[PDB]
Design an enzyme around this catalytic site. Structure first.
Site, mmCIF file in Angstrom:
data_model
loop_
_atom_site.group_PDB
_atom_site.id
_atom_site.type_symbol
_atom_site.label_atom_id
_atom_site.label_comp_id
_atom_site.label_asym_id
_atom_site.label_seq_id
_atom_site.Cartn_x
_atom_site.Cartn_y
_atom_site.Cartn_z
ATOM 1 C CE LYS A 1 -1.014 -0.380 5.228
ATOM 2 N NZ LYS A 1 -1.725 0.183 6.470
ATOM 3 C CG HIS B 1 -0.252 -0.159 12.261
ATOM 4 N ND1 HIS B 1 0.236 1.090 12.627
ATOM 5 C CD2 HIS B 1 0.148 -0.424 10.996
ATOM 6 C CE1 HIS B 1 0.923 1.532 11.588
ATOM 7 N NE2 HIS B 1 0.888 0.664 10.575
ATOM 8 C CD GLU C 1 1.268 -6.447 9.061
ATOM 9 O OE1 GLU C 1 0.842 -5.650 9.927
ATOM 10 O OE2 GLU C 1 0.557 -7.331 8.539
#
Lengths: 442, 442
Positions: free
Chosen positions: A111, A241, A315
């Site tokens: 992304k 996250h 990530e």
């Protein structure tokens, strides 16, 4: 400020090689299925495919950019906008990650910048892939960037049915979940899935907070585990996250401590978690450094996840891509007005808010505008190329007086810029100049 | 509220035809080089190319949409998002324009929606084209939508050098200008140019005001004319834009009166202006109507531009496209939270802020969310498909309680939506269903 960190790159490529008798510099194997020799060759092959010219600098990063911009200004027009992409900075960020957290394997968040050379370099360096759509899963699989679909994590806690079906047919297994209704969907369309429970974080300090839309609250993890056991879903881990662009070290420590409590709760339902995914949030540019963050995460991982039975993954998106790109825009038009004899100096550049500068709105970005060959300070207003008055990157602020033909250099434009950019009014930045700040390929 | 205005369409296609002995219904010839027979055939040909199924309704517009949506829900997935494009509403808006302002020929602003069927229908109906970039000029010329490059106006007051060069090589002549530095550029790269001076407007009442970036102030028109005569530039007219989405009738009247003063000033420099371009701003959906605006513009055009020596043109964008599109999105995911026993109902739909709903930020839009088959009112939050918490189309507002599988219908989504939309996270709305609300092609 430094233009490169050559010493880290040399240590990274040496690790696990015959020159050091296949020895690693920590209790962890190198990231990736490739041997150290195969990995160095695969990186050089990508550099060849994209005709990467090695340009080495000790020079500050700004000085390195100003010098390379003057060189690159002279199927495109001479005044067209362009990006200088330093693929060496990508390699270097991977070397920096390995040196700081060898216990954590990075799975690139596509992304942030799905540029094919960026995906290819990171595949060759041993990174995994974090995909959020069937389109993202397809651009990794269709370009043969992973040896197995186990190297893709489908990190979108809420997925469309056709996406759940397509990831199953593709062999994708590791899939994120944070709500009871999603557990039922995974059980139906992804029967071979290895569910990863995403939990809520104290992300208030982040540039972009996401707990509003994603992350099961701690009190709801109980009913979520309950539903996984119910729909015969395999919970293999926990993810989190702390928000994109978060310098709060306490939020990383707090999330790992909370993730440990979930590992405990999971035993009671028949689940032995084997994966801890610490997500993104890490800075990509040179007050909080990536090193300071790694320094506070390392001890907590040893304290609660240092048993050796669990694999630790991340990530990062912005971390790997932000510093790789520099945007060059030509000042092609100008007019002066009278402020309500004060004079407003309005200029028009060939990139703006509808394309590369959408980050001003979606990412809360505040890019740096560098006048290439710096003149008195005037009340300046700078616009993009579209017919909209809203397409403005700077409104009535002091800036050195510019002339037509001048160039603006905007460094650190590799994340959440071209990835979300549209084509309004038919304007786009298409010219790319591939360079490498690190010595690696002769 | 009405689903169609069949009577206007019938009168539009009859005008200038053999059935009425090639007679026009006013002192103005029909728009376009085609005869009335050739024009009706060219429209039907476009309808054939895009397989447009004629669907006629008296039904309100909302009822027409709700009924067609239920029909269309059953290379794509059944739950994928999609647009129902009513090309009949485009035709009808052209019929409505002709009936109200036959003295004004409309030049479609491509920027609002460059969909190839929309460009083809408008070309066949006699409309001209308003282009802002060499990309826009190329998509009109490359698809053979104009018989001559004189039917393209390059309405971007500030252009890149490579764009000035490409429009000259293409034969494009009518080009906008509002600043002394731009006059010099046109003289150099477009020697065969017919310059149109763009003036400033009282646009404060507009949805999107643009006088901040474009439009020569009245006091500066004097020095601009001076520079045109100086660089041997031919000033053939005056243009203006009262801002996009402007219902202020007084702003249209005020701009034509100001444009007349410029026509006078132009004589003193050796220029006899022959073109009055009244720009855009007209509403495209059914308190200010397009009719009320036309009613106040007609007398002023007769008073100051009713001599017969000047051609009057316009550049509507939103007017022609807004009501043509309806967006259908599936509610594929959901979760409930506790408000800080109050419960927040969060839903996830397959379109949002990064794609079709960018208009919420760039256009100041406030679309209407219609639950397809309407349940108690809950504190609802609706998100797009991306991993961003910012991708939110509705935050904590009362809305009927929804379930997975439900559809949201968003009418009037044809302008400044897909035209500026990006592809962040790899999500896009690709399925298109072409329909016609007006009887025209058997």
């Amino acid at each position: 400020s430094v233009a490169s960190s050559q010493d880290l790159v040399d240590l990274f490529f040496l690790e696990g090689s015959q020159a050091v008798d296949g020895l690693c510099f920590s209790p962890y194997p190198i990231y990736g299925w490739r041997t150290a020799e195969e990995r160095r060759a695969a990186v050089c092959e990508v550099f060849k495919t994209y005709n990467v010219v090695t340009r080495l600098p000790i020079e500050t990063r700004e000085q390195y950019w100003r010098r390379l911009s003057n060189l690159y200004t002279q199927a495109y027009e001479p005044e067209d906008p362009f990006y200088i992409i330093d693929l060496g900075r990508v390699v270097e960020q991977m070397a920096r990650w390995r040196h700081e957290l060898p216990m954590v394997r990075p799975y690139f968040a596509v992304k942030s910048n799905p540029q094919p050379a960026v995906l290819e370099v990171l595949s060759a360096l041993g990174a995994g892939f974090d995909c959020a759509s069937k389109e993202e899963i397809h651009m990794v699989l269709g370009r043969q960037l992973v040896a197995s679909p186990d190297d893709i994590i489908f990190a979108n806690p809420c997925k469309q049915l056709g996406d759940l079906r397509e990831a199953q047919a593709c062999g994708v297994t590791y899939v994120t979940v944070d709500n009871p209704l999603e557990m039922e969907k995974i059980s139906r369309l992804m029967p071979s899935a290895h569910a990863i429970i995403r939990i809520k974080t104290n992300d208030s300090k982040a540039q972009c907070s996401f707990s509003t839309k994603f992350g099961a609250p701690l009190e709801d993890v109980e009913g979520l585990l309950e539903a996984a056991r119910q729909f015969n879903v395999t919970v293999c881990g926990v993810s989190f996250h702390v928000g994109s662009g978060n310098d709060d070290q306490s939020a990383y420590v707090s999330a790992v401590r909370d993730a440990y409590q979930v590992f405990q709760q999971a035993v009671q339902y028949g689940f032995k978690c084997t994966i801890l995914d610490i997500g993104g949030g890490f800075p990509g540019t040179e007050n909080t450094s990536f090193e300071a963050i790694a320094r506070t995460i390392r001890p907590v991982l040893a304290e609660l996840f240092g048993g050796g039975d669990v694999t630790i993954i991340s990530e990062p998106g912005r971390y790997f891509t932000a510093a790789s790109h520099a945007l060059l825009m030509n000042v092609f038009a100008s007019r002066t007005l009278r402020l309500s004899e004060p004079e407003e100096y309005q200029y028009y550049v060939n990139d703006g808010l509808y394309h590369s500068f959408n980050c001003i709105l979606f990412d809360h970005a505040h890019p740096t505008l560098l006048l290439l060959n710096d003149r008195p300070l005037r009340i300046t207003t700078i616009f993009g190329p579209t017919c909209d008055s809203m397409d403005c990157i700077l409104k009535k602020q002091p800036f050195p007086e510019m002339k037509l033909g001048d160039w603006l250099l905007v460094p650190d434009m590799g994340s959440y810029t071209t990835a979300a950019a549209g084509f309004f009014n038919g304007f786009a930045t298409r010219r790319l100049e591939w360079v490498s700040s690190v010595d690696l390929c002769a």
